[PDB]
């Protein structure tokens with residue numbers, strides 16, 4: 001019959017966790033409904049005219065087809081998507097559709113797949129714009145909390161639930177950054193010193209989560225000198241914003257490949273940091289860590 | 297009057313934790329005694345003729361002088377050292393003397409310094425052969441357990457006690473590897489792909505310790521493709537040994553800059569893995585995680 005879900009936006013990289021770390025947000029999210037239909041075609045409806053309805057281009061259609069073929073399902077599906085945020089925002093918008101679809105198909109056709117397999121299937125949607133199955137946004141979208149994609153072929157995801165309170169502020173510029181281009185501009189090689197720094201700071205962030213230390217987590221998050229300083233130059237007022245909220249947040253950095261900005265405000269300054277972000281970007285959201293795709 | 301301590305050998309790097317991770321061993325260790333003397337000179341006695349007695353070259357003398365001057369102590373010290381293992385073995389031999397001395401001076405002159413400051417002082421001994429204050433061996437020697445040096449200037453050390461049982465096997469070749477040379481041969485730059493791999497695998501090792509997962513810890517430890525494959529070529533039979541103990545250990549890798557080899561055998565094959573290591577290197581030791589410098 002049919003299944004409807006809310007599939008969350010996610011923030012990847014988190015500074016020194018480039019291509020590994022993922023943090024699931026509670027908002028924004030896509031609302032996706034999948035209905036089994038007798039005709040074997042896959043029909044897609046989406047409320048954002050800039051997103052393809054062709055089932056071989058829309059990531060939801062790509063993921064559904066792969067799963068339907070893999071299990072010889074024999075039915076088509078009509079997928080209706082209401083977008084939480086536009087693509088190219090650095091918030092895992094496409095991944096929300098890829099993950100939500102994987103989860104919905106799994107429920108609809110009772111495939112009983114585990115979370116890792118759902119992330120693996122969702123990652124095929126993320127391939128439609130990569131040449132490679134990136135899973136750092138679809139992993140948190142499925143698992144909720146904080147995730148680390150620690151291996152590919154085969155995929156490995158380690159999950160750390162966030163049991164404490166972690167306020168999040170997200171500023172969403174109206175401009176977009178194409179992720180392939182965002183990657184082309186990155187250095188092809190990094191110095192041994194940056195390797196040592198990022199490995200240490202990233203490991204420190206993991207220790208910080210197990211020790212519920214927001215200050216440590218946020219400070220190490222801001223120590224990347226390899227990727228963030230390069231991509232931050234694509235974002236108007238990003239460095240000025242970092243300076244203005246300096247002692248009022250545990251940390252602030254680029255969400256995914258940008259241009260969205262993610263900040264972890266200190267309890268005492270949450271309204272003030274939100275207002276500062278709003279001053280620059282009217283589309284600013286207050287949220288927290290999410291629990292992953294779920295039925296709605 | 298006088299203070300006598302046992303200062304443990306330590307294993308740094310642990311594969312993807314290059315220049316960050318440190319694991320304290322219970323054995324071998326140096327036995328170091330420090331006695332306050334009226335004359336302000338620093339006298340050093342050491343049972344290894346290949347180690348300098350000049351107080352400005354022996355790391356124990358360098359560390360003691362720095363601490364004595366910093367606190368206007370006004371007394372000299374006579375330091376007697378009985379070495380656990382030779383320098384250039386990849387087991388933090390010099391660091392054991394540096395850390396043991398820092399700890400002993402702190403006790404002898406009642407300086408009440410915390411562990412981090414002791415590691416910082418010990419790291420000045422490690423400077424006598426670096427140009428830089430490396431702390432990845434002195435940190436575990438002082439803290440015990442597993443440590444991560446996550447920042448320099450100022451020094452930051454995160455400590456993770458090892459509460460579970462972790463059997464360790466150490467093979468000590470009779471040859472030495474000069475650490476400065478071991479570093480010169482490393483690549484000056486690494487690919488973005490290796491940065492992603494090592495950050496993810498190193499973070500996975502941290503997660504593995506908090507989840508007491510030896511298999512995960514050991515497997516990720518062996519995923520470094522940047523440093524270990526280069527230095528392993530300096531160690532006779534190292535790759536052959538890895539292949540022979542393959543399914544009998546949680547993991548095996550180079551200790552520090554080598555040539556010593558550190559393995560974490562599975563409970564079922566401990567005698568068999570020790571015998572294999574002994575076949576190649578008569579000086580093989582069975583040990584476990586240590587608790588750091590202590591009085592003896």
Ligand SMILES: Nc1ncnc2c1ncn2[C@@H]1O[C@H](COP(=O)(O)OP(=O)(O)NP(=O)(O)O)[C@@H](O)[C@H]1O
Nearest residue numbers: 057058059087088089090091092093094095097256
């Ligand atoms: N259901 C969908 N939702 C969003 N984008 C889609 C969808 N289906 C196909 N796409 C296309 O795929 C591309 C995904 O772009 P991308 O810039 O990576 O968005 P992103 O999914 O928002 N992730 P990121 O910016 O990395 O957080 C765009 O070209 C989209 O047109």
Ligand SMILES: Nc1ncnc2c1ncn2[C@@H]1O[C@H](COP(=O)(O)OP(=O)(O)NP(=O)(O)O)[C@@H](O)[C@H]1O
Nearest residue numbers: 353354355383384385386387388389390391393552
């Ligand atoms: N008390 C000491 N114990 C050991 N070496 C010392 C000591 N004092 C001075 N040294 C000298 O410092 C150098 C330290 O060499 P090194 O090869 O790094 O040993 P290592 O301390 O054994 N550490 P590593 O091999 O990195 O685990 C040698 O040249 C030694 O002669």
